[PDB]
Amino acid sequence: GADIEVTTTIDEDVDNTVCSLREAVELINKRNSSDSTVVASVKDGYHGCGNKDASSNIILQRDKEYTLNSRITITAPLTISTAKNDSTLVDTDQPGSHNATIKMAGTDQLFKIDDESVEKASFSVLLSDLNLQGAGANSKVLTGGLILNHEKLTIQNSRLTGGYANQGGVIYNQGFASKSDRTFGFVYIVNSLIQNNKAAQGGVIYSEQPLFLITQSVIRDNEVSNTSGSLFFSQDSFDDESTGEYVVQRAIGLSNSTVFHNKGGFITNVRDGMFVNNITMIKNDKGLFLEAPQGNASISNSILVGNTINCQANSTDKAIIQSNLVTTECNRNASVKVPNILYPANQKLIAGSTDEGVCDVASKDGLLCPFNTPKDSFLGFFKPRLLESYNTLADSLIINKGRLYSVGLASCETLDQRGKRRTGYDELCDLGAIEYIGLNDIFEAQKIEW
Amino acid sequence: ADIEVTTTIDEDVDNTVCSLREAVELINKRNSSDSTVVASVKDGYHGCGNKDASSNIILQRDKEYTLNSRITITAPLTISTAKNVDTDQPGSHNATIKMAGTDQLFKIDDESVEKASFSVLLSDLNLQGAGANSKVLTGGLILNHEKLTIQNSRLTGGYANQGGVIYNQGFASKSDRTFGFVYIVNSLIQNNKAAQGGVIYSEQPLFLITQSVIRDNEVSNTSGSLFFSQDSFDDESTGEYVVQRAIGLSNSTVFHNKGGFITNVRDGMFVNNITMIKNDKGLFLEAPQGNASISNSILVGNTINCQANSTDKAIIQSNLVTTECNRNASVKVPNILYPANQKLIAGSTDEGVCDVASKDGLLCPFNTPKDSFLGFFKPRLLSLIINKGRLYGLASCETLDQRGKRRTGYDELCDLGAIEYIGLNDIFEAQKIE
Ligand SMILES: [Mg+2]
Ligand SMILES: [Mg+2]
Ligand SMILES: [Mg+2]
């Protein structure tokens, strides 16, 4: 049926003619109630949010800001997204430039997602094309600065900012995973910008077990104040003998993501069952903390240099690190068939002197362009450089150094951070979050000449 | 008169017998705002007569009432066992509510956004959950969103993912008066299990357990707690709560529990005059403001007695402690150090007959007198706990002990733990000199 379009930007639950975001969620919660009188109470709507065969899709208007004075509790599957324009019209606007904003005006988290139904467990929630802004420095949140989650949470095409808490700056993810514990929270984030989030532990995500997957995203300017902690922190390991299947499945970890300028502790603590593939992790305080003692973790096809601490291992760890651009710090447990690419001492990582800015095509050194967001892209990245000092592609430390065979646990991703397909010509791919595709640097070098 | 349940089976069928489910439905429908639903129960509901029937549901002594799925309570009511003057052991004739399926026993919630919470009383009952056959996720016995009071009862067999006995929903504020609050008095909590919140999983610390026994429970997450609160109160309210002693644990015996901690002490909570011995893990301290008080308790004999996070400032005064629970910042009301070589219990086991002719045991083994519903560890006259508290001030003794006996003056002194030593039974039974 019809989607629920929120018709006021204020935070309210008052029976009147307008529909608020809180009321739109409360409508979907009540239609999902196990009490027949509650379901019948919202047969024709709830306090301004019309119903009568309405969908579970909540629509927010483009370029509008919706304020919350306290948390919204979600007890039923639903989606919240920004209204989409006509696709048959010329849309040259930059992606994500018209996202609706959900803004915390108080000191609370934005959402709590949980369920207390007799069976009928683990529903899904989709947050799409939204600007989620937390309380920031005014936050009083203990766990989950933006969201406390116990369900199947997917966030896409979104900005995640201002999530401050003691544990889990963006998300605190509850729940343990086993054959008997089937009601656990899981976090899936794709094509999103994660910035300005802080926590004492789990600066971005604090999860009780490795139950998150971050792909095609930018992670910048976040902090975990415990310098031994992590931005994506797993409190406990899995109950053994199951991690050998999780890693080959590549269901938990980080992929196709650019991670730079983060502060304090590590990006993530790599436990058994987790994987890291095709990420660009540079210019951070700390990179990867390795504690996969069974050897059921995989780190591949990534750029893991230019951080104050690139890798650091716990007392027992056997994480398989292969086909990465690394220094000696991260050259651990590498196989002879899939070795890492060692980072030479005399190697300049970024062209020019700025970590972020316009790239100088007429620069003879520098593996990567500075960070930049093209006008046709939501997220920015460090584009690999095809230098003139490369007689062949074998001279590059990044380009065509991976293998694109779900084969061998060292295969590149099918896509890159931008969502573009990695062609896999000659079964080869580029290290890091970005596959080299367009050759405008070569075109421009001919025009600048003479 | 009260609503008398006249069958032990579970049903909602229009016939000649009144079931517990139909007795609750009668009260729910009478409280409805729909005048047609109210009229449908004008002359009773499906066998439960309703002409002079109140909101008190009565179950028969020594009878077991089976539920095959949960009952949803949406209206104020009480459930209790019929009375009888009476010299039997208290609680020996309780009616039993037993889950025969895989569900929780009760969901207590009208699901109203605006309406303030209503009151439900469960008195003199044996509540037994599905146990190993449970499929419950939240609230092995009760999913609560209202003002739930449980007294004189047994709470056993509650198995769930969150909240072995009770899952308590709600946040407390002047603009949100729909929060649930659990008040448990003179009850036995035993053989319950959860991944988090082995007994109570609560969103905020909205519970007070007093004069009760907590034994043989488990929270499988070794970082979790039996009485677990997921969130904290507002910083501005914790100062009042700790002084008023609104939420926490008092006058209770806690032993033989497994897995994680007994409770995670957040700001606003208090612990006073408990005997917390022989557990896997004791208290987890999590009060960064310093607005939490732990006093007059016995906090030794557990594998882990206390453990705090980096920022905890919980006030720990006048307790029997080891290194983990001791604080050098308590100079005026210090704790008492428990020696290692001393035997905690003057007996061969943790439960059974007390060894009267001894000078090495601080407490008698756990024993239930025949004139009492709950048992306890009675102190012995030898010293480390007798007259070590002050009646009198966050460190004041409770006015009563677990048994409801008054802790007398005794030069403004009281005994640490859940039991006040009153009778000189130790000294009289030393007549064995032959
Ligand atoms: Mg309205
Ligand atoms: Mg009947
Ligand atoms: Mg209510």
Numbering used by the authors:
A (entry chain A): 2 to 406, 411 to 455
B (entry chain B): 3 to 86, 91 to 388, 397 to 406, 413 to 454
List passages from the publication reporting this PDB structure.
Here we introduce RFpeptides, a denoising diffusion-based pipeline for designing macrocyclic binders against protein targets of interest. We tested 20 or fewer designed macrocycles against each of four diverse proteins and obtained binders with medium to high affinity against all targets. X-ray structures for macrocycle-bound myeloid cell leukemia 1, γ-aminobutyric acid type A receptor-associated protein and RbtA complexes match closely with the computational models, with a Cα root-mean-square deviation < 1.5 Å to the design models. RFpeptides is not limited to generating macrocycles with particular motifs or topologies; the diffusion process generates macrocycles with diverse shapes and sizes and selects the topologies appropriate for the protein being targeted. Among the four targets tested here, binders for MCL1 and MDM2 have helical motifs, binders for GABARAP have a β-sheet topology and binders for RbtA sample looplike conformations that make extensive contacts with the flat surface of this target.
We designed macrocycles against Rhombotarget A (RbtA), a recently identified cell surface protein from the ESKAPE pathogen, Acinetobacter baumannii. There are no experimentally determined structures available for this protein and sequence-based searches against the Protein Data Bank (PDB) did not return notable matches to other protein structures. We predicted the structure of the 617-aa full-length protein using AF2 and RF2; both methods predicted similar overall structures (Cα r.m.s.d. of 0.4 Å over 509 residues excluding the signal peptide and transmembrane domain) with high confidence (predicted local distance difference test (pLDDT) > 90). AF2 and RF2 both predicted two distinct extracellular domains: an N-terminal β-helix domain and a C-terminal Ig-like domain. We expressed the Avi-tagged version of the RbtA N-terminal domain (residues 20–458) and used it for binding screens using SPR. To confirm the structures of RbtA and RBB_D10 and the binding mode between them, we determined the high-resolution X-ray crystal structure of apo and macrocycle-bound RbtA using X-ray crystallography at 2 Å and 2.6 Å resolution, respectively. The apo structure of the RbtA N-terminal domain, which is also the first experimentally determined structure from this class of bacterial proteins, matched our AF2 and RF2 predictions for this target very closely, with an overall Cɑ r.m.s.d. of 1.2 Å and 1.1 Å between the X-ray structure of the RbtA N-terminal domain and the AF2-predicted and RF2-predicted structures, respectively.
